[PDB]
mmCIF file of C-alpha atoms and ligand atoms in Angstrom:
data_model
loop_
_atom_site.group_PDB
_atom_site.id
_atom_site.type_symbol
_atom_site.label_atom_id
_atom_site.label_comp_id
_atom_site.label_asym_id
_atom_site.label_seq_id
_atom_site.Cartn_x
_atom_site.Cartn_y
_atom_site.Cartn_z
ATOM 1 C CA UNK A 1 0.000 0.000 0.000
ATOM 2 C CA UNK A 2 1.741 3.327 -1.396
ATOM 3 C CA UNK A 3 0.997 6.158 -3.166
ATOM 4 C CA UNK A 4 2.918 9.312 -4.874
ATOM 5 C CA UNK A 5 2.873 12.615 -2.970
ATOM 6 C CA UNK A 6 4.749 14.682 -5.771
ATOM 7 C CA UNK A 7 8.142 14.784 -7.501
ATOM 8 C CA UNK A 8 11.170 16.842 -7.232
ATOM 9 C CA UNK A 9 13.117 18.057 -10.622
ATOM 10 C CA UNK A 10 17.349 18.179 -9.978
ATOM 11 C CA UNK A 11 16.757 18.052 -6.365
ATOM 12 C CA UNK A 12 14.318 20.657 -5.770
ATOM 13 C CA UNK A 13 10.820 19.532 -4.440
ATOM 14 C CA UNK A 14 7.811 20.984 -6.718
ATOM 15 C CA UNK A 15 5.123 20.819 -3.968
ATOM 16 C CA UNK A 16 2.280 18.383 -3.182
ATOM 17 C CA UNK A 17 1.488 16.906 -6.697
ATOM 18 C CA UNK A 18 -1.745 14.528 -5.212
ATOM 19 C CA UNK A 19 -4.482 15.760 -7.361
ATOM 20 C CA UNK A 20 -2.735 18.458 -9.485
ATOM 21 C CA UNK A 21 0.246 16.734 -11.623
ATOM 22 C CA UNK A 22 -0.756 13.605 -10.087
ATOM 23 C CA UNK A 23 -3.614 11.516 -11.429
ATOM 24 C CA UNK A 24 -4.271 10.165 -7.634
ATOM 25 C CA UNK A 25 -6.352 7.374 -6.738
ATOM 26 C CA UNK A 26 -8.569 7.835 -3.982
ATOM 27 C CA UNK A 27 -6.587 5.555 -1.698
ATOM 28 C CA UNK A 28 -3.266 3.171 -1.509
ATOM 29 C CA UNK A 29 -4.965 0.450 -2.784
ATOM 30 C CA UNK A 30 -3.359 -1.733 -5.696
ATOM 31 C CA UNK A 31 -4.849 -2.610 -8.505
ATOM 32 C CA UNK A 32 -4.451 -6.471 -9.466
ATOM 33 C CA UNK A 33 -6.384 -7.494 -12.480
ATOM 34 C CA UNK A 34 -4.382 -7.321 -15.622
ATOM 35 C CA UNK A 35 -6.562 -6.924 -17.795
ATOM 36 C CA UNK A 36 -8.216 -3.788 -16.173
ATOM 37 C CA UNK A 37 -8.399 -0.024 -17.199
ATOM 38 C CA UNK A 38 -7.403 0.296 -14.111
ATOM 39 C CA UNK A 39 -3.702 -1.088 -15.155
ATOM 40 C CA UNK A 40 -3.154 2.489 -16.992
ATOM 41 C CA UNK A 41 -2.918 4.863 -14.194
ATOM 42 C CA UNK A 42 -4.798 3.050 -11.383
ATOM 43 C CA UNK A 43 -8.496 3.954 -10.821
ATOM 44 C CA UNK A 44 -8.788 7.367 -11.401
ATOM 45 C CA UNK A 45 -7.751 7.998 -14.821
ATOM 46 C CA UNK A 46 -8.262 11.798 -15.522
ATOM 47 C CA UNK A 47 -6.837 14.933 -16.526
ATOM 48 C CA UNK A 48 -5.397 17.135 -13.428
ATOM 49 C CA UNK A 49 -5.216 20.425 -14.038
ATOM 50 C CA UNK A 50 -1.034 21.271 -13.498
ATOM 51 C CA UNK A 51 1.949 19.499 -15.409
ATOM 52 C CA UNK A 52 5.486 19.836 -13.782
ATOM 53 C CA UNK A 53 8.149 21.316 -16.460
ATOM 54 C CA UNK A 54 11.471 19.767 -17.090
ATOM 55 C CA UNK A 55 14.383 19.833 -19.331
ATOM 56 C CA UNK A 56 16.119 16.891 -21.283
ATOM 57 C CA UNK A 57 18.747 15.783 -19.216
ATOM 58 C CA UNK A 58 16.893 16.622 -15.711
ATOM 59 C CA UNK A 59 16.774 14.161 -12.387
ATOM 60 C CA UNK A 60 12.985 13.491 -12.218
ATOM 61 C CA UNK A 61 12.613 11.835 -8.335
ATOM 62 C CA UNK A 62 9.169 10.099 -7.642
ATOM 63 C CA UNK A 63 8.762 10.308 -3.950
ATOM 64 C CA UNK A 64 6.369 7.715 -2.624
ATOM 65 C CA UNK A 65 4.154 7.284 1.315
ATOM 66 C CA UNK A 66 2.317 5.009 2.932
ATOM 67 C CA UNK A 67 -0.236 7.522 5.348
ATOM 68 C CA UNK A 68 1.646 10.242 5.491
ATOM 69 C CA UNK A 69 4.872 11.957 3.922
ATOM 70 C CA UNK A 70 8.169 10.297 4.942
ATOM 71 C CA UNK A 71 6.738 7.522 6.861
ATOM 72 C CA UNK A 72 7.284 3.973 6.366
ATOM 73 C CA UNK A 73 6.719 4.364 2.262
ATOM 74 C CA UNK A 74 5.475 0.812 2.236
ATOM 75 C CA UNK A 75 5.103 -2.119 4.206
ATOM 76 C CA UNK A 76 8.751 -4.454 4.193
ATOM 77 C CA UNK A 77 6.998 -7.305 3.259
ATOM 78 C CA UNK A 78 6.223 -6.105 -0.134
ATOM 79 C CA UNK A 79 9.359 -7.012 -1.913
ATOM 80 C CA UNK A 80 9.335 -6.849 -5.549
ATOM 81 C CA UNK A 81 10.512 -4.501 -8.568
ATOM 82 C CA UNK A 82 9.968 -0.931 -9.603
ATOM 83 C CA UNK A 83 9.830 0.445 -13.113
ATOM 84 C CA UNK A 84 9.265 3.755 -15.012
ATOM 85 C CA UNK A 85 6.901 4.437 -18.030
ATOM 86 C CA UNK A 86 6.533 7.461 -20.509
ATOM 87 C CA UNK A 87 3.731 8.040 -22.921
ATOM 88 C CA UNK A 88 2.563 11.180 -24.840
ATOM 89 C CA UNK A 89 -0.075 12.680 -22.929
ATOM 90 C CA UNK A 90 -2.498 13.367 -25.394
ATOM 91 C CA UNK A 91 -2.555 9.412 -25.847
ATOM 92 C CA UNK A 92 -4.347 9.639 -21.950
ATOM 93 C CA UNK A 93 -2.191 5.991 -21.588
ATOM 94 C CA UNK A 94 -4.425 4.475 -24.180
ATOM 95 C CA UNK A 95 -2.942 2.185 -27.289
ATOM 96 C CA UNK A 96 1.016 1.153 -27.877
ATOM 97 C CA UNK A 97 2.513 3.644 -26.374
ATOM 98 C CA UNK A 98 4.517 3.132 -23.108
ATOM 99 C CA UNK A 99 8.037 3.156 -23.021
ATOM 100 C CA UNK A 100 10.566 2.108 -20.211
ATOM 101 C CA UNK A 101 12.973 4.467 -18.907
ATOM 102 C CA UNK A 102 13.708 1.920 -15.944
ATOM 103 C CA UNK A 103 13.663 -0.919 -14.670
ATOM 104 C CA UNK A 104 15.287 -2.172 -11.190
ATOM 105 C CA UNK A 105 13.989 -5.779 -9.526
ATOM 106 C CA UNK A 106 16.805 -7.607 -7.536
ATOM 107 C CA UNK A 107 20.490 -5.988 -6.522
ATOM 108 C CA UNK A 108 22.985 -8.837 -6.377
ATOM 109 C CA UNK A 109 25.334 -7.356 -4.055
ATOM 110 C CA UNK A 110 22.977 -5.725 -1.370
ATOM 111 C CA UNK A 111 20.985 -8.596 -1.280
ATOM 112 C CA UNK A 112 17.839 -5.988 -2.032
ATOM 113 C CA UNK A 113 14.406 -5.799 -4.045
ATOM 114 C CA UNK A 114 14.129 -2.176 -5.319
ATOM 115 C CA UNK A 115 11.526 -1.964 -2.554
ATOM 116 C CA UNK A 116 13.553 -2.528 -0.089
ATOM 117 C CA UNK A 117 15.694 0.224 -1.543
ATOM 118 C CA UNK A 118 13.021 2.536 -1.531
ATOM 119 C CA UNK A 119 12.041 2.267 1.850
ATOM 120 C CA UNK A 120 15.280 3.029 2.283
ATOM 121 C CA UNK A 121 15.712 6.241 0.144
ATOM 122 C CA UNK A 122 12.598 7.654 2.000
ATOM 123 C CA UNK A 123 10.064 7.164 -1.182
ATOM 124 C CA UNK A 124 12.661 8.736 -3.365
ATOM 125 C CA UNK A 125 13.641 7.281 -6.920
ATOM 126 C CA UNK A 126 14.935 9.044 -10.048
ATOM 127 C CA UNK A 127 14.858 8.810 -13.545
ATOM 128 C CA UNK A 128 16.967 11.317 -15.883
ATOM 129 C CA UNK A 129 14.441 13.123 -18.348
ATOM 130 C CA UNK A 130 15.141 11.776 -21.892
ATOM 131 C CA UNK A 131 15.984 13.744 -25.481
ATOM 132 C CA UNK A 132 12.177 13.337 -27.162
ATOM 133 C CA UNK A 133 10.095 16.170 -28.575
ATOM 134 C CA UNK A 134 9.314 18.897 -26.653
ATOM 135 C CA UNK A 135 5.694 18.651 -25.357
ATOM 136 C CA UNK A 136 3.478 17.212 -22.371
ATOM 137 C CA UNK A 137 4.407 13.707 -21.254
ATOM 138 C CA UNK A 138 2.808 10.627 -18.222
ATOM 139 C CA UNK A 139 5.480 9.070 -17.061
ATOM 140 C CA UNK A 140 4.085 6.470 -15.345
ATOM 141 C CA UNK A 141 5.943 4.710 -12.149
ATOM 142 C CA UNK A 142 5.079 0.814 -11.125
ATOM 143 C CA UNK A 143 5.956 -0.942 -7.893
ATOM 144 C CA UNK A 144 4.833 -4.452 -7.730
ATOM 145 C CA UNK A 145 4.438 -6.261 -4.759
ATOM 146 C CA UNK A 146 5.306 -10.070 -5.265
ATOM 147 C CA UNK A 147 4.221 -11.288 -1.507
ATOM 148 C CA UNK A 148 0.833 -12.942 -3.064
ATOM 149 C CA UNK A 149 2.424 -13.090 -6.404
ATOM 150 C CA UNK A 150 2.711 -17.431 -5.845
ATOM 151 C CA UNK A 151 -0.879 -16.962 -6.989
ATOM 152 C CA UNK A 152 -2.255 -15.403 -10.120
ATOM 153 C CA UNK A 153 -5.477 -12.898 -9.605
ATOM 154 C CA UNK A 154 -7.484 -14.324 -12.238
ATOM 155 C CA UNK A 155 -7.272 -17.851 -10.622
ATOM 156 C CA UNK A 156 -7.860 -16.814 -6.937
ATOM 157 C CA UNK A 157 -8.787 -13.196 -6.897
ATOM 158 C CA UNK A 158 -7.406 -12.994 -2.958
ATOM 159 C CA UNK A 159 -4.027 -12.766 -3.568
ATOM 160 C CA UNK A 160 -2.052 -12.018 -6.757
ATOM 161 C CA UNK A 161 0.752 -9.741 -7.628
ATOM 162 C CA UNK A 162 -0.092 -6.208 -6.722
ATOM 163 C CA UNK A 163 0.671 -3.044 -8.902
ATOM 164 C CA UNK A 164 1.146 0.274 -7.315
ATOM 165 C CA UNK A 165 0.796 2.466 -10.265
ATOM 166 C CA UNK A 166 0.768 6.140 -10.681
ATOM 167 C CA UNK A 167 1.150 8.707 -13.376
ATOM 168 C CA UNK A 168 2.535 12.256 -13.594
ATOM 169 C CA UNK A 169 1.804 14.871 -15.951
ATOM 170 C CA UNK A 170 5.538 16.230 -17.414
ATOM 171 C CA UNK A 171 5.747 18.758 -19.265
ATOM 172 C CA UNK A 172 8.969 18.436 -21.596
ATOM 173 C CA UNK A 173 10.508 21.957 -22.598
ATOM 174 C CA UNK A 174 13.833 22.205 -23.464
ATOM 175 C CA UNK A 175 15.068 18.841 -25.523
ATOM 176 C CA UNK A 176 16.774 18.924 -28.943
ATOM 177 C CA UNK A 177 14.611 15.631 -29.158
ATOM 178 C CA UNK A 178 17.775 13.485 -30.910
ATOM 179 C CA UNK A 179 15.489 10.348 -29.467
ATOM 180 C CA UNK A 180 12.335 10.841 -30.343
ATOM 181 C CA UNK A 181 10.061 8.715 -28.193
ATOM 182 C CA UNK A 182 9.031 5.095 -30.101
ATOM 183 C CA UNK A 183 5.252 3.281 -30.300
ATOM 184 C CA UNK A 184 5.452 1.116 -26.561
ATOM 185 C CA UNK A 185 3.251 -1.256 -25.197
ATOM 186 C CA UNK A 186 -0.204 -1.380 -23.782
ATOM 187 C CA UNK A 187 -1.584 -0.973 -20.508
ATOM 188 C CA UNK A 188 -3.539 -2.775 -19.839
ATOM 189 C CA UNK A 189 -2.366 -5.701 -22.090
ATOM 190 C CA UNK A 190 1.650 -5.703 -21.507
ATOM 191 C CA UNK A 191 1.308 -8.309 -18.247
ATOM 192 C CA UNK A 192 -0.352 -11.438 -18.589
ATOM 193 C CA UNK A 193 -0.557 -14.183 -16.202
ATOM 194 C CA UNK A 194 2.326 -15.839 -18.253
ATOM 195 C CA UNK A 195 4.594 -13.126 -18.476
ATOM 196 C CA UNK A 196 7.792 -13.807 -16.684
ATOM 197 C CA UNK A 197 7.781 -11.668 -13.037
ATOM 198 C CA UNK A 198 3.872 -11.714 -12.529
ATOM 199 C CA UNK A 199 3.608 -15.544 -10.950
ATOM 200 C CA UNK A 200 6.523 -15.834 -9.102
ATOM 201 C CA UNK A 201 7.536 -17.384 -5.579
ATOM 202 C CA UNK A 202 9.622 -14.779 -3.482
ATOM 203 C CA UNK A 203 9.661 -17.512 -0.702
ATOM 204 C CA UNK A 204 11.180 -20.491 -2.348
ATOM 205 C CA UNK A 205 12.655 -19.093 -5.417
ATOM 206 C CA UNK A 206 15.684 -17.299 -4.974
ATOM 207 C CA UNK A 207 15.489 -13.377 -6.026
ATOM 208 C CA UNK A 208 18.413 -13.933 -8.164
ATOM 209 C CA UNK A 209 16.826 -16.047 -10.118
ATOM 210 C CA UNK A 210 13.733 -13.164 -10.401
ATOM 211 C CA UNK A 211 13.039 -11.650 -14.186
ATOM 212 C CA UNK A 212 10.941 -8.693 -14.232
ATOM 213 C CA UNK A 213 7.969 -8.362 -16.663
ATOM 214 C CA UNK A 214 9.171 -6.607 -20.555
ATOM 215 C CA UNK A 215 9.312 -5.131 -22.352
ATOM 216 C CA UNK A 216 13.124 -4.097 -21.430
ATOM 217 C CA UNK A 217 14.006 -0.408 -20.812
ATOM 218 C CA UNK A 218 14.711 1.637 -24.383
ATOM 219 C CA UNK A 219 18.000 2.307 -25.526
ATOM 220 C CA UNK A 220 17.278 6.583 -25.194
ATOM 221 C CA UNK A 221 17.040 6.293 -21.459
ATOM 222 C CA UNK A 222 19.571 7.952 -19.289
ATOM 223 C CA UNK A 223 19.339 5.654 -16.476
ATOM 224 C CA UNK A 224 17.778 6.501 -12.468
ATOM 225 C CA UNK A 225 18.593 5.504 -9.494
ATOM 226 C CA UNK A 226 16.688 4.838 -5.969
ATOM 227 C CA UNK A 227 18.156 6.688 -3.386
ATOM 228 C CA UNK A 228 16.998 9.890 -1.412
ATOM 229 C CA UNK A 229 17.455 13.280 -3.525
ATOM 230 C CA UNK A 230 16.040 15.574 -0.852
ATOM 231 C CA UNK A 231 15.404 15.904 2.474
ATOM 232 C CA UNK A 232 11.336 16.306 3.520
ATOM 233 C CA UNK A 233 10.934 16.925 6.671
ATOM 234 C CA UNK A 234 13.504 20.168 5.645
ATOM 235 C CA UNK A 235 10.055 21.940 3.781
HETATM 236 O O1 LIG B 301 2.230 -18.181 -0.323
HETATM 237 C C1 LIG B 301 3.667 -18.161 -0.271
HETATM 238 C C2 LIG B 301 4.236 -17.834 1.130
HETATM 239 O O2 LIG B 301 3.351 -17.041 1.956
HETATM 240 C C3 LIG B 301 4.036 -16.437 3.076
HETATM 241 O O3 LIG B 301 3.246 -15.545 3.920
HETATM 242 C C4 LIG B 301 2.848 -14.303 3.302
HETATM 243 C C5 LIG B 301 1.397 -14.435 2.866
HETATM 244 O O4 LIG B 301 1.291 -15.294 1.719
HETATM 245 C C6 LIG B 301 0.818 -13.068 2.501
HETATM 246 O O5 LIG B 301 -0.545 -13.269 2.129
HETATM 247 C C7 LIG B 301 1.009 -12.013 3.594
HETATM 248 O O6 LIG B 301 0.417 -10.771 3.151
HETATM 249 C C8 LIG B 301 0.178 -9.746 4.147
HETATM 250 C C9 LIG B 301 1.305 -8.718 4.119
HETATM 251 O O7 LIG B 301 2.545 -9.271 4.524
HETATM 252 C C10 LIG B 301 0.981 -7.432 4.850
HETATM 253 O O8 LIG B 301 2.034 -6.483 4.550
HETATM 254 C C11 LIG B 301 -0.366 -6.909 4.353
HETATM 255 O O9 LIG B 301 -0.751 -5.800 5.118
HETATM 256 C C12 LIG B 301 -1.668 -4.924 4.459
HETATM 257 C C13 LIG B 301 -3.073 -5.200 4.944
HETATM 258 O O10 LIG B 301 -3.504 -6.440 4.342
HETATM 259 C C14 LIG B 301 -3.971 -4.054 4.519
HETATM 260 O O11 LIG B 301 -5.260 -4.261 5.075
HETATM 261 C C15 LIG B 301 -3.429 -2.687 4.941
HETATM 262 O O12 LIG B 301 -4.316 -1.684 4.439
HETATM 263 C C16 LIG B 301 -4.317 -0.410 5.118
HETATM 264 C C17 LIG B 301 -3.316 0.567 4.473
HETATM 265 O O13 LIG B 301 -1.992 0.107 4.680
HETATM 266 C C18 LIG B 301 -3.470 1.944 5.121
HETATM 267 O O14 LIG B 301 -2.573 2.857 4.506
HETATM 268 C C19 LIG B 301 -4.898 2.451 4.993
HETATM 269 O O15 LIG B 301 -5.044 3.741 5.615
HETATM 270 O O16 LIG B 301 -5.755 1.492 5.629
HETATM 271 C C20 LIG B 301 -5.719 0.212 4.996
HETATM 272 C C21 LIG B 301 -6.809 -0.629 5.654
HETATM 273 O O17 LIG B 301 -6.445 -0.805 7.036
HETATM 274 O O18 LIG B 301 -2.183 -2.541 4.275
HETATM 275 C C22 LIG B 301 -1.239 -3.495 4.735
HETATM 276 C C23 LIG B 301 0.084 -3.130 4.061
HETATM 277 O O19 LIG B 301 0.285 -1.755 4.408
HETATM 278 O O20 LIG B 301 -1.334 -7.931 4.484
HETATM 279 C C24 LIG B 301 -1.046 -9.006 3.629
HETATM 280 C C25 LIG B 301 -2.284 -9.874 3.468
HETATM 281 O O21 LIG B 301 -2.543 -10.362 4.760
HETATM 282 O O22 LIG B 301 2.423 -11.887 3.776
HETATM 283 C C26 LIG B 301 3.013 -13.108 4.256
HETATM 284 C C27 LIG B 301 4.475 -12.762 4.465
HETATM 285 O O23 LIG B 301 4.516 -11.513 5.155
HETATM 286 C C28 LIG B 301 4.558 -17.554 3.988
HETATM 287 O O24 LIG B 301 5.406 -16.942 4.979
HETATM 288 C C29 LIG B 301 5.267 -18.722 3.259
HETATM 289 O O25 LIG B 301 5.144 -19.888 4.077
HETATM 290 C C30 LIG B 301 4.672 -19.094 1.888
HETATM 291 O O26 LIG B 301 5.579 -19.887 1.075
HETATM 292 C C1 LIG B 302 -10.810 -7.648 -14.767
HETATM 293 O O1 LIG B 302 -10.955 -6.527 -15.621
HETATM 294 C C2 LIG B 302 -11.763 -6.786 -16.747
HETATM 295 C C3 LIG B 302 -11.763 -5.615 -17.739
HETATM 296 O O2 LIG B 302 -12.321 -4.447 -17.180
HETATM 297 C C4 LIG B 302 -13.142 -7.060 -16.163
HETATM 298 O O3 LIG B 302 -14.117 -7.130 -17.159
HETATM 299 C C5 LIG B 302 -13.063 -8.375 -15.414
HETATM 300 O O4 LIG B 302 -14.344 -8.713 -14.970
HETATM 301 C C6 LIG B 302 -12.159 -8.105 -14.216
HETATM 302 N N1 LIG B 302 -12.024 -9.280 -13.355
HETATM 303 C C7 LIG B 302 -12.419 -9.229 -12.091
HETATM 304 C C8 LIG B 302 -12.271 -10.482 -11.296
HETATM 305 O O5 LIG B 302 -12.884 -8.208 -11.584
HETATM 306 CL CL1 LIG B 303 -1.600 -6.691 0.992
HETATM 307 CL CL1 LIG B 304 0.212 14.655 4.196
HETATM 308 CL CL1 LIG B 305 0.599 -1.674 7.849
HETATM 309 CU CU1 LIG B 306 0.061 -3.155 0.384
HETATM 310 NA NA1 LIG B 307 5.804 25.746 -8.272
#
């Protein structure tokens, strides 16, 4: 259970996003059946009135919460990956058109899901804003939860991997756009129940041998991080 509270752009916090750049659900719960609406940018799928402006080449942090700012971020026992989506905006997340910027699941040498990490970095993780065309942008950030993930939804629709999904309205200024963006994948339609990363055993598997859902991250993306960018309990 987690939601966004805003993002910061090269370190500097741009306010409470939960309703304005955010498209907010109404609470931290996850969404579970792939095949739902729901799967594009959680339940409440609208325009919000503000978009957050960036450059090509800017740190873009997502900063995640449980109940309030800074707290937990999520409960420990939801290990599993986290990943990064853009879109054109005008596309409102429908058709082939999401594209990974990143992608982090299981870290070798500290032993750590990207979750883990997160909880760590106080909600914080970072993607740096690629060369496309100038113009208004969802980039869309996933968590999923593999602690019910030994189950598929569809088959028992109490437990199931969980997505944590929420999208923020970017606005893209500067860029000299030498990538421009590529056709992606649907959401819904990109996980199915057979898709490596969705079923999975975090128990009785080892997390080494864990491979998170494709498509893989495109070759124009500058990379990202999970680790704290700013300090909130400063504002
Ligand atoms: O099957 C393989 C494997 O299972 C192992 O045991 C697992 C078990 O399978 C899981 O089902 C169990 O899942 C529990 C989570 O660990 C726990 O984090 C989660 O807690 C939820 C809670 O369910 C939910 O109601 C709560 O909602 C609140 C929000 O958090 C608040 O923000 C909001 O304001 O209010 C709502 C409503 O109160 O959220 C929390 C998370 O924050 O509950 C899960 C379901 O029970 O985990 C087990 C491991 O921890 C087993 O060990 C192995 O033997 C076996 O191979
Ligand atoms: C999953 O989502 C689809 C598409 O909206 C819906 O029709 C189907 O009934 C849902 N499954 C469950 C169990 O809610
Ligand atoms: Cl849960
Ligand atoms: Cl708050
Ligand atoms: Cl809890
Ligand atoms: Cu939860
Ligand atoms: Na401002």
């Amino acid at each position: 259970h987690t939601l966004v509270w805003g993002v910061w752009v090269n370190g500097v916090d741009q306010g409470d996003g939960r309703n304005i750049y955010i498209r907010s659900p109404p609470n931290n719960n996850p969404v579970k059946n792939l095949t739902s609406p729901d799967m594009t940018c959680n339940v409440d799928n609208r325009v919000v009135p503000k978009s957050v402006p960036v450059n090509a080449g800017d740190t873009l942090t997502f900063e995640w919460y449980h109940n309030t700012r800074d707290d937990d971020i999520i409960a420990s026992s939801h290990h599993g990956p986290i990943a990064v989506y853009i879109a054109p905006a005008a596309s409102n997340g429908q058709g082939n058109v999401w594209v990974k910027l990143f992608e982090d699941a299981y870290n070798v040498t500290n032993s750590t899901w990207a979750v883990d990490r997160l909880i760590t970095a106080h909600g914080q993780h970072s993607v740096v804003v690629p060369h496309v065309a100038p113009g208004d942008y969802l980039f869309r950030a996933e968590i999923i939860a593999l602690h019910e993930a030994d189950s598929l939804y569809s088959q028992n629709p109490i437990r199931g991997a969980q997505f944590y999904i929420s999208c923020a309205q970017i606005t893209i200024n500067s860029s000299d756009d030498s990538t421009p963006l590529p056709a992606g994948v649907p959401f819904p339609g990109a996980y199915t129940d057979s898709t490596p990363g969705i079923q999975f055993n975090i128990y009785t598997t080892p997390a080494t041998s864990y491979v998170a859902p494709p498509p893989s991250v495109w070759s124009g993306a500058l990379g990202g991080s999970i680790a704290q960018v700013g300090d909130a309990s400063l504002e």
